[model samples]
Target: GSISLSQEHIDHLNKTLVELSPQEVLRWAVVTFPNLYQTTAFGLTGLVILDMISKTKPVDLIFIDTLHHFPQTYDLVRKVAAAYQPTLHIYKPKGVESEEEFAKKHGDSLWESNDDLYDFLVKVEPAQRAYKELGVNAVLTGRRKSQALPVIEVEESSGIIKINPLWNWDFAQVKAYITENAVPYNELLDLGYKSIGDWHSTV
Candidate 1:
């Protein structure tokens, strides 16, 4: 039987992946692990990876639409979907359609009322549902320690093997890659936003 990755192996993989082009890295992942999916939050970095991966292999792209994203965010989603045409799978929280409805039922700004609960219901739970529903065994993400918190514990994490192909990339490197490859990016990035999430949280 094939063995799971060890911490040392994961560290080496992190370094190796960083050196490869996004296209090459994604191709390698798909060829190495047949059961692979790409989970996206529709952020700039996520779009960059999606643009690269979709060009190489047919990826199952999962989007956890919280229904509270900015109109621009939704527009970008449509544009990217049309451009990449990945097998997109969108998931939402159980029985919820709009943020207004969620607020009306759960109280206004549930994020303000309970951050953990908000993350659970809006992000974590929906992501779990996507994984199960899609039968995802391995997933790709756009997490990079240079942009945010370090995720060194990924090697020990259970369930699906989350592949962070851009873990070592700096913001500048990401920008250069996008420009060099002529990848479509979020317009918000040009508008001085370093990061973009849901509309309410973005500005």
Candidate 2:
């Protein structure tokens, strides 16, 4: 299944969607796509989107567990699942489960030796497989501009459409939303971590 969207289609939507609130954009996504899901890493932007979606339309979620995230990230995941109860599908690196197994298969510290392959194995490949296996065509992303369009086709070659409702928001706005809403988030933020990635990669 695919959504054959044109440049004109995307441009037209962006013109109006840019004016609407994230909540309104989310509602549009729910009504527009049949197999829509939000792909997130549980970042502040994603959390805000989740809270908004939960109130009206409970869209399913997709989380790609690279198996090297901070402990608090996993804790936040659990909290999100319990709170939203969305059909959360987790994808991991192929042929590996634990970090030990991943390192054993690819050799330890693969990211340093071969960053490209390491990223593919841990994050990119799994995300591609997730989309294929789940038959997802359109996905809601937490991406925000710190100028992104509300909706766009990922690339002409890739058979996916991405909707970023929070495209206009920045870090401050996202943090404010999270704090004001009391959204469940990773505790690492309190420790001065601006961005959250793998345990090894993040500060």
Candidate 3:
């Protein structure tokens, strides 16, 4: 699937979306794109976006299970699905099902040996496949302006537009929103993982 917005229109979208609240940005995406999905790893900001989108206009979710995630992360995924009921699409590496299978094929510490190759197989391949199979032209991401970014942007190569609804939000704001809304999160956060990704690299 291809994105409908051109460079000029995407620029205009970011310019205008920067001023509105995240919810408004999300509403714009829901109304504008026919095949929109929320891609998340169940991080703080992403979970907040999930809650907001659930209320505004629930979109299908795309989660990349690298097969090296923590139990706590998987737990949060289950809880989030139960709570919101989005059509959750879980993608994994192209030819493997479990971590053991991944290691058997690629050898243990594949990331240490070849980070780019590891990423291509586990992250890039499955994600693009999800986009292709699900017909997702646009995706709502968890990236925030606190990290210095935009509310709406385009991936020229992938032809997928990314909408960062929480682009203007910070860590404190995200945590506060989660707490106030009773949103479920990874227990790993309580264990000192500020940013949760694949268990092998995340710290």
- Model 1 worst lDDT window (10 residues): 147-156
As for TM-score, the candidate ahead, 2 or 3, is 2
- Candidate 2 vs candidate 3: the lDDT winner is 2
Candidate 3 accuracy as lDDT: 0.87
Candidate 1 backbone collisions, by pair: none
Candidate 3: tens digits of C-alpha lDDT, residues 1-203: 47667678878877788888888888888898888998988899888988988887788989999999988888888887788888889999988999999999999989899999999999999998998899888899998755458777788788788888887777888989999999999998887767888888986
Write model 1 residue lDDT over 36-117, tens digit each, in one string: 7888777767877886775666788889998787777788888887877778888887789998888987788887789888
Ranking by lDDT: 2, 3, 1
The true-versus-predicted C-alpha distance at residue 177 of model 3, in Å, is 0.1
Model 2: which ten-residue window has the lowest total lDDT?
A: 147-156
List residue ranges in candidate 2 displaced over 4 A.
147-150
* Model 1 ranges off by over 4 Å: 1-3, 6-19, 145-157
Q: Tens digits of per-residue lDDT for model 2 on 6-93?
A: 7778789888888888899999989998889999999888899999998897888899999898899999998987977888999999
TM-score of each: 0.84, 0.95, 0.94
Q: Which candidate is the best by lDDT?
A: 2
